Write a protein that binds this ligand. Sequence first.
Ligand SMILES: [Mg+2]
Ligand SMILES: [Mg+2]
Ligand SMILES: [Mg+2]
Ligand SMILES: [Mg+2]
Ligand SMILES: [Mg+2]
Ligand SMILES: [Mg+2]
Ligand SMILES: [Mg+2]
Ligand SMILES: [Mg+2]
Ligand SMILES: [Mg+2]
Ligand SMILES: [Mg+2]
Ligand SMILES: [Mg+2]
Ligand SMILES: [Mg+2]
Ligand SMILES: [Mg+2]
Ligand SMILES: [Mg+2]
Ligand SMILES: [Mg+2]
Ligand SMILES: [Mg+2]
Ligand SMILES: [Mg+2]
Ligand SMILES: [Mg+2]
Ligand SMILES: [Mg+2]
Ligand SMILES: [Mg+2]
Ligand SMILES: [Mg+2]
Ligand SMILES: [Mg+2]
Ligand SMILES: [Mg+2]
Ligand SMILES: [Mg+2]
Ligand SMILES: [Mg+2]
Ligand SMILES: [Mg+2]
Ligand SMILES: [Mg+2]
Ligand SMILES: [Mg+2]
Ligand SMILES: [Mg+2]
Ligand SMILES: [Mg+2]
Ligand SMILES: [Mg+2]
Ligand SMILES: [Mg+2]
Ligand SMILES: [Mg+2]
Ligand SMILES: [Mg+2]
Ligand SMILES: [Mg+2]
Ligand SMILES: [Mg+2]
Ligand SMILES: [Mg+2]
Ligand SMILES: [Mg+2]
Ligand SMILES: [Mg+2]
Ligand SMILES: [Mg+2]
Ligand SMILES: [Mg+2]
Ligand SMILES: [Mg+2]
Ligand SMILES: [Mg+2]
Ligand SMILES: [Mg+2]
Ligand SMILES: [Mg+2]
Ligand SMILES: [Mg+2]
Ligand SMILES: [Mg+2]
Ligand SMILES: [Mg+2]
Ligand SMILES: [Mg+2]
Ligand SMILES: [Mg+2]
Ligand SMILES: [Mg+2]
Ligand SMILES: [Mg+2]
Ligand SMILES: [Mg+2]
Ligand SMILES: [Mg+2]
Ligand SMILES: [Mg+2]
Ligand SMILES: [Mg+2]
Ligand SMILES: [Mg+2]
Ligand SMILES: [Mg+2]
Ligand SMILES: [Mg+2]
Ligand SMILES: [Mg+2]
Ligand SMILES: [Mg+2]
Ligand SMILES: [Mg+2]
Ligand SMILES: [Mg+2]
Ligand SMILES: [Mg+2]
Ligand SMILES: [Mg+2]
Ligand SMILES: [Mg+2]
Ligand SMILES: [Mg+2]
Ligand SMILES: [Mg+2]
Ligand SMILES: [Mg+2]
Ligand SMILES: [Mg+2]
Ligand SMILES: [Mg+2]
Ligand SMILES: [Mg+2]
Ligand SMILES: [Mg+2]
Ligand SMILES: [Mg+2]
Ligand SMILES: [Mg+2]
Ligand SMILES: [Mg+2]
Ligand SMILES: [Mg+2]
Ligand SMILES: [Mg+2]
Ligand SMILES: [Mg+2]
Ligand SMILES: [Mg+2]
Ligand SMILES: [Mg+2]
Ligand SMILES: [Mg+2]
Ligand SMILES: [Mg+2]
Ligand SMILES: [Mg+2]
Ligand SMILES: [Mg+2]
Ligand SMILES: [Mg+2]
Ligand SMILES: [Mg+2]
Ligand SMILES: [Mg+2]
Ligand SMILES: [Mg+2]
Ligand SMILES: [Mg+2]
Ligand SMILES: [Mg+2]
Ligand SMILES: [Mg+2]
Ligand SMILES: [Mg+2]
Ligand SMILES: [Mg+2]
Ligand SMILES: [Mg+2]
Ligand SMILES: [Mg+2]
Ligand SMILES: [Mg+2]
Ligand SMILES: [Mg+2]
Ligand SMILES: [Mg+2]
Ligand SMILES: [Mg+2]
Ligand SMILES: [Mg+2]
Ligand SMILES: [Mg+2]
Ligand SMILES: [Mg+2]
Ligand SMILES: [Mg+2]
Ligand SMILES: [Mg+2]
Ligand SMILES: [Mg+2]
Ligand SMILES: [Mg+2]
Ligand SMILES: [Mg+2]
Ligand SMILES: [Mg+2]
Ligand SMILES: [Mg+2]
Ligand SMILES: [Mg+2]
Lengths: 159, 185, 49, 58, 148, 222, 51
Amino acid sequence: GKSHGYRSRTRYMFQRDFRKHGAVHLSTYLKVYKVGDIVDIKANGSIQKGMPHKFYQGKTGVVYNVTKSSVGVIINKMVGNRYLEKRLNLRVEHIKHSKCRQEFLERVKANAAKRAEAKAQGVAVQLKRQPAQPRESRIVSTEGNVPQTLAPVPYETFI
Amino acid sequence: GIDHTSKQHKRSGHRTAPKSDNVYLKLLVKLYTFLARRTDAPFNKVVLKALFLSKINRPPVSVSRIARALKQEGAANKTVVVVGTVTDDARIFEFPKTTVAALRFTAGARAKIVKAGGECITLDQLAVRAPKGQNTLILRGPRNSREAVRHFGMGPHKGKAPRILSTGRKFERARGRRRSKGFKV
Amino acid sequence: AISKNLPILKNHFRKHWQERVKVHFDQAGKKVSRRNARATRAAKIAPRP
Amino acid sequence: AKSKNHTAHNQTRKAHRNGIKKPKTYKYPSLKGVDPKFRRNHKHALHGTAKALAAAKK
Amino acid sequence: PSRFTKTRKHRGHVSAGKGRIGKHRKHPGGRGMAGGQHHHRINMDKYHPGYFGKVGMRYFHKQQAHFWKPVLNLDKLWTLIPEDKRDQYLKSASKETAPVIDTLAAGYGKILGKGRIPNVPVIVKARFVSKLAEEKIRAAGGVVELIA
Amino acid sequence: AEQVAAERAARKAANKEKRAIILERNAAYQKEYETAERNIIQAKRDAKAAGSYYVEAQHKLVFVVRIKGINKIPPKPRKVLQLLRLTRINSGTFVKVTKATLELLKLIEPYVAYGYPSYSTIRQLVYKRGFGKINKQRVPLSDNAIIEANLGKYGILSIDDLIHEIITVGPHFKQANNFLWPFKLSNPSGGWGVPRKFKHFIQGGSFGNREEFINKLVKSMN
Amino acid sequence: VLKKNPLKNKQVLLRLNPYAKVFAAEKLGSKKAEKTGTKPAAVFTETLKHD
RNA sequence: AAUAUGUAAGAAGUCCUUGUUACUUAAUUGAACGUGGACAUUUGAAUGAAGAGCUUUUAGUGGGCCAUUUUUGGUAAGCAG
RNA sequence: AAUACUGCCAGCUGGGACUGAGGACUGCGACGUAAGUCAAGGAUGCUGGCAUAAUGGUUAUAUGCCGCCCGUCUUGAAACACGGACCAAGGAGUCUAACGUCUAUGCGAGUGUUUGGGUGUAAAACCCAUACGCGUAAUGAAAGUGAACGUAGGUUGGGGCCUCGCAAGAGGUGCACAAUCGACCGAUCCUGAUGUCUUCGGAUGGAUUUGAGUAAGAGCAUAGCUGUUGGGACCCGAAAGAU
RNA sequence: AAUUGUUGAAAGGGAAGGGCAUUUGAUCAGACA
Ligand SMILES: [Mg+2]
Ligand SMILES: [Mg+2]
Ligand SMILES: [Mg+2]
Ligand SMILES: [Mg+2]
Ligand SMILES: [Mg+2]
Ligand SMILES: [Mg+2]
Ligand SMILES: [Mg+2]
Ligand SMILES: [Mg+2]
Ligand SMILES: [Mg+2]
Ligand SMILES: [Mg+2]
Ligand SMILES: [Mg+2]
Ligand SMILES: [Mg+2]
Ligand SMILES: [Mg+2]
Ligand SMILES: [Mg+2]
Ligand SMILES: [Mg+2]
Ligand SMILES: [Mg+2]
Ligand SMILES: [Mg+2]
Ligand SMILES: [Mg+2]
Ligand SMILES: [Mg+2]
Ligand SMILES: [Mg+2]
Ligand SMILES: [Mg+2]
Ligand SMILES: [Mg+2]
Ligand SMILES: [Mg+2]
Ligand SMILES: [Mg+2]
Ligand SMILES: [Mg+2]
Ligand SMILES: [Mg+2]
Ligand SMILES: [Mg+2]
Ligand SMILES: [Mg+2]
Ligand SMILES: [Mg+2]
Ligand SMILES: [Mg+2]
Ligand SMILES: [Mg+2]
Ligand SMILES: [Mg+2]
Ligand SMILES: [Mg+2]
Ligand SMILES: [Mg+2]
Ligand SMILES: [Mg+2]
Ligand SMILES: [Mg+2]
Ligand SMILES: [Mg+2]
Ligand SMILES: [Mg+2]
Ligand SMILES: [Mg+2]
Ligand SMILES: [Mg+2]
Ligand SMILES: [Mg+2]
Ligand SMILES: [Mg+2]
Ligand SMILES: [Mg+2]
Ligand SMILES: [Mg+2]
Ligand SMILES: [Mg+2]
Ligand SMILES: [Mg+2]
Ligand SMILES: [Mg+2]
Ligand SMILES: [Mg+2]
Ligand SMILES: [Mg+2]
Ligand SMILES: [Mg+2]
Ligand SMILES: [Mg+2]
Ligand SMILES: [Mg+2]
Ligand SMILES: [Mg+2]
Ligand SMILES: [Mg+2]
Ligand SMILES: [Mg+2]
Ligand SMILES: [Mg+2]
Ligand SMILES: [Mg+2]
Ligand SMILES: [Mg+2]
Ligand SMILES: [Mg+2]
Ligand SMILES: [Mg+2]
Ligand SMILES: [Mg+2]
Ligand SMILES: [Mg+2]
Ligand SMILES: [Mg+2]
Ligand SMILES: [Mg+2]
Ligand SMILES: [Mg+2]
Ligand SMILES: [Mg+2]
Ligand SMILES: [Mg+2]
Ligand SMILES: [Mg+2]
Ligand SMILES: [Mg+2]
Ligand SMILES: [Mg+2]
Ligand SMILES: [Mg+2]
Ligand SMILES: [Mg+2]
Ligand SMILES: [Mg+2]
Ligand SMILES: [Mg+2]
Ligand SMILES: [Mg+2]
Ligand SMILES: [Mg+2]
Ligand SMILES: [Mg+2]
Ligand SMILES: [Mg+2]
Ligand SMILES: [Mg+2]
Ligand SMILES: [Mg+2]
Ligand SMILES: [Mg+2]
Ligand SMILES: [Mg+2]
Ligand SMILES: [Mg+2]
Ligand SMILES: [Mg+2]
Ligand SMILES: [Mg+2]
Ligand SMILES: [Mg+2]
Ligand SMILES: [Mg+2]
Ligand SMILES: [Mg+2]
Ligand SMILES: [Mg+2]
Ligand SMILES: [Mg+2]
Ligand SMILES: [Mg+2]
Ligand SMILES: [Mg+2]
Ligand SMILES: [Mg+2]
Ligand SMILES: [Mg+2]
Ligand SMILES: [Mg+2]
Ligand SMILES: [Mg+2]
Ligand SMILES: [Mg+2]
Ligand SMILES: [Mg+2]
Ligand SMILES: [Mg+2]
Ligand SMILES: [Mg+2]
Ligand SMILES: [Mg+2]
Ligand SMILES: [Mg+2]
Ligand SMILES: [Mg+2]
Ligand SMILES: [Mg+2]
Ligand SMILES: [Mg+2]
Ligand SMILES: [Mg+2]
Ligand SMILES: [Mg+2]
Ligand SMILES: [Mg+2]
Ligand SMILES: [Mg+2]
Ligand SMILES: [Mg+2]
Ligand SMILES: [Mg+2]
């Protein structure tokens, strides 16, 4: 019949990275997780215990619980026409801290400074992010830079 | 041809006049649309709506839920307003003075209010006393104290009262309700 | 014939019940008849009560 | 009499009618599945700092 | 009445609102509670968990009445006194003269203690009290007098 | 009771001051406009003079009209058409050019024709078929007091104060441009020029960015 | 009760935009711009006519 | 790789001060929850928004078929998936 | 120098078509030294014809273009798929018992006169004692026990109201509702005080356990659309089986 | 009512009936004042 076991189809998903097999390096267990941390899930094939289901691979969530060797991560899986709440019990080897918030944090502290230094200067701030605007006008120089004229080339084979 | 972004010809889904046919109800509704159109006071807009609410959404306000409201800091001289009937509660032993304006007062609670030295105002006397609702404290009854809402959202692990006629053991209490008869919920 | 979230009912109508329906159409009848029955017993019974 | 076996045709049509609702978010989430030994002590923690704050309006 | 019935509105359309594919045949699922373990089990577990199978003990020839024992809380209690008489005793709370309430005369079997009665002494005759009911009475200076 | 001419006077005098501010305002844009244009003309000249090449700024405003009808549209372009408020055929809106919307225009090129509006065609769009969203209620612009009531918050108290905010992509181009109901154009009055419409402008159809050729299109559809 | 297009209704053209009278009165629509005579560098002319 | 796909873009925020406990540390260490204080809409991209959220009950349906693109079986099919 | 080409003008101007909604005034303006005038929030002026089958409605016919049999089941029917020659008159979701949601009404910690009695202008209307039913307590298989640490709790959002301010806004209080952490009652598991007819008694404090519970009641009754189950059960239909 | 006879009117080159439109014939309302 058909097959649909718990790790079905994960041939390459749980493979190990090229020339990167073996013990997990000792920082993986030196990282520290707190309730509220945003973490990325990537299962480690070498650590069978406390492993996410293939669905939660590549998926980011928030820790809600911190145990001896593990973290509880709630994740919103969308079943049907709605999202449900899913809490996962992962071990520290399959989780990792998401830099998806660093850009935000790096922008918060920066935003405070831009604001304090401008206020203590004389207002005029503007610290929302804006998209890429079109280019401005410019004058390009011909000096040392005469236009090299091109034409399409004929047909050849060289085989 | 327009690519519509929203359902077309959709009713707002809020009542517009009470569904009741009571003449006197329509008169109070008459009074209060006027007040609500020409006063800029919010209290009139709220009151105007409550007059449309169906009997479910007019749970009785007990006389003791009122006495509680007057125990709020700085709320004890406010004149409470109930857009519904007010029921007596034999469980409070001391009731304060104050003025309660309602659609109905039960025989029991009108006593308990008047006895302790208060006053029972119909919602139009209230309009005259307080066109902007000055010094009013509107109380609503408890809506989900209704019995029927026990059965709403029934389902596995929802803890939610089966629509049952006779009860007791022998009445939906075995397989699927205990670890030893198949499973539990 | 099981559907929706409805209370399980027990409407015992699987015998030939329509044969044994008693409508008390004579309710007013038999009260009139009971009142007259006592008004006769009263009179038969002399001053006894 | 064979007939069709399966399709996801038209299912995303339907799911999008009344939405794909966002997951809903609450300040103060539930402690459901949190370590018991933490919660036990934390029950006593709030109790304590509750008591200290009534002692701040005594 | 029949003039408001939706079938008046269905007149003229072929199917009476019952569908052209799906028809309105006799009994598709079978009659009654048929197949509550089979084609209808999804609806029996949920909406009706606990329906199949046995629990507890049988009890041949149980006479309810044996177990007649209505309950009343301190919650009420003072309500068993007529309201005019009531205020007389609420004030002048003492021993020497304290109301007798025959809660069986009011047709109650047990007194529970839902909560808080004024500090008036009351003499409570009843068949059964709850530990709290009985303790809360005393804190007001009343007693409970076991009757039958 | 006075008012009669008393508060008639208080108003009619202040209605004369508003037109005063508008006249001195509209006079200024005009100077700005032509001097802006003459400056560029001289930029290009002075560059060839200096043996070099003047490249203009990329346009920052664009005007998009829906070319394609309503049905058989894939879900993604179909959202973007809704977000761009072009939900019916031949209507059109202005769009500010940024990375985050240049990528929107890309996603709907098979269904829209757009390009670079000239002051003349922005002017004649607002004047003739310019309406305002005011409690929805698509209101015709017909009087300058309509605008100031709803856009006076942000400057902008004349119909040309609008056009100025649009054409220059001002600080409040979002609120000014959204204040305008989508423009409802008719079919081009001389026809489309191409035999078949739903090819790119470059391939001899009508859709995509035809740059300043949008003006001849739009002017016939107005 | 009836939108009058400006553009062809002078009355309404002047209800909006009071500058319309200035603008008409000073031609402006046909403003003769300044006559200058800058000629292009030969680098420009060469590369233009080049191949 | 392309196309698809997880998360983030703030008031439920950020920073100072220092309380509660039975958890935890060699330790008033930490963890969790707090009292008190400092900073407002350029308060943290875009575009849109005939508003947003929520609750109850109930019909019909549960034979589907076609097109472009991807694609399995078959020499193929107006074939089967 | 000119011209083309492309673009602009709040430059002028002719021919043609369709429309004329609104019904005192009110608005934004324009022209005028001015008085006034205007094409400025929707047609008026002048002239003629007939006052009639002239126009218009109906109808029959002709002409241009167009138009397959309805009903049904079906992915697909005009089908070489079925029913239907024609017309009249019958002709199919009903009533009941018990229910879910919703709504209107009565009264409300209650509610329900109509088994019955009283009475009557007599199947009506009017009146009513004792019970009973449902509700006001839950939880255990059961024996049983049985709902305030506290302003009936803390936190966060809440309409409304109160206070300051001209206002914008700030504080105060905050029902309903939602989220969260606690407290109470029963089941389960621990703990086992003071005592004792030495095995009875079970205070007290607890636990990732558990209940259709408590935490200032919301119910009862009549009615109605829809929906549910049993009934001949929307109407018509077996092959059979039994006495 | 189906259906039939008579009389009157009208149309008909392998069906009939229908839609929008107008000519022609027949017929009729209203409005003028
Ligand atoms: Mg397989
Ligand atoms: Mg695999
Ligand atoms: Mg193992
Ligand atoms: Mg309502
Ligand atoms: Mg409520
Ligand atoms: Mg209850
Ligand atoms: Mg219910
Ligand atoms: Mg039960
Ligand atoms: Mg269901
Ligand atoms: Mg029976
Ligand atoms: Mg049977
Ligand atoms: Mg029988
Ligand atoms: Mg009989
Ligand atoms: Mg009789
Ligand atoms: Mg089969
Ligand atoms: Mg097949
Ligand atoms: Mg199927
Ligand atoms: Mg009827
Ligand atoms: Mg009808
Ligand atoms: Mg219908
Ligand atoms: Mg019909
Ligand atoms: Mg139906
Ligand atoms: Mg159907
Ligand atoms: Mg049918
Ligand atoms: Mg079908
Ligand atoms: Mg099932
Ligand atoms: Mg059973
Ligand atoms: Mg047994
Ligand atoms: Mg037994
Ligand atoms: Mg007790
Ligand atoms: Mg836009
Ligand atoms: Mg591009
Ligand atoms: Mg031409
Ligand atoms: Mg033409
Ligand atoms: Mg063409
Ligand atoms: Mg062609
Ligand atoms: Mg045009
Ligand atoms: Mg590639
Ligand atoms: Mg994406
Ligand atoms: Mg301490
Ligand atoms: Mg603070
Ligand atoms: Mg945004
Ligand atoms: Mg964008
Ligand atoms: Mg917007
Ligand atoms: Mg809106
Ligand atoms: Mg349904
Ligand atoms: Mg099936
Ligand atoms: Mg179904
Ligand atoms: Mg079927
Ligand atoms: Mg392919
Ligand atoms: Mg096929
Ligand atoms: Mg030209
Ligand atoms: Mg021109
Ligand atoms: Mg007119
Ligand atoms: Mg008119
Ligand atoms: Mg003048
Ligand atoms: Mg005029
Ligand atoms: Mg005539
Ligand atoms: Mg004549
Ligand atoms: Mg005629
Ligand atoms: Mg006539
Ligand atoms: Mg004539
Ligand atoms: Mg005529
Ligand atoms: Mg004829
Ligand atoms: Mg004909
Ligand atoms: Mg044809
Ligand atoms: Mg037919
Ligand atoms: Mg077939
Ligand atoms: Mg079908
Ligand atoms: Mg076919
Ligand atoms: Mg057919
Ligand atoms: Mg055929
Ligand atoms: Mg057949
Ligand atoms: Mg036949
Ligand atoms: Mg029938
Ligand atoms: Mg019925
Ligand atoms: Mg009621
Ligand atoms: Mg009671
Ligand atoms: Mg009677
Ligand atoms: Mg009488
Ligand atoms: Mg009689
Ligand atoms: Mg009487
Ligand atoms: Mg009696
Ligand atoms: Mg009773
Ligand atoms: Mg009972
Ligand atoms: Mg109950
Ligand atoms: Mg109680
Ligand atoms: Mg209990
Ligand atoms: Mg019991
Ligand atoms: Mg015991
Ligand atoms: Mg305690
Ligand atoms: Mg205690
Ligand atoms: Mg807290
Ligand atoms: Mg506030
Ligand atoms: Mg507060
Ligand atoms: Mg407990
Ligand atoms: Mg248990
Ligand atoms: Mg047990
Ligand atoms: Mg129960
Ligand atoms: Mg209750
Ligand atoms: Mg109720
Ligand atoms: Mg309903
Ligand atoms: Mg049925
Ligand atoms: Mg038969
Ligand atoms: Mg037979
Ligand atoms: Mg037979
Ligand atoms: Mg047999
Ligand atoms: Mg025989
Ligand atoms: Mg022939
Ligand atoms: Mg005709
Ligand atoms: Mg006349």
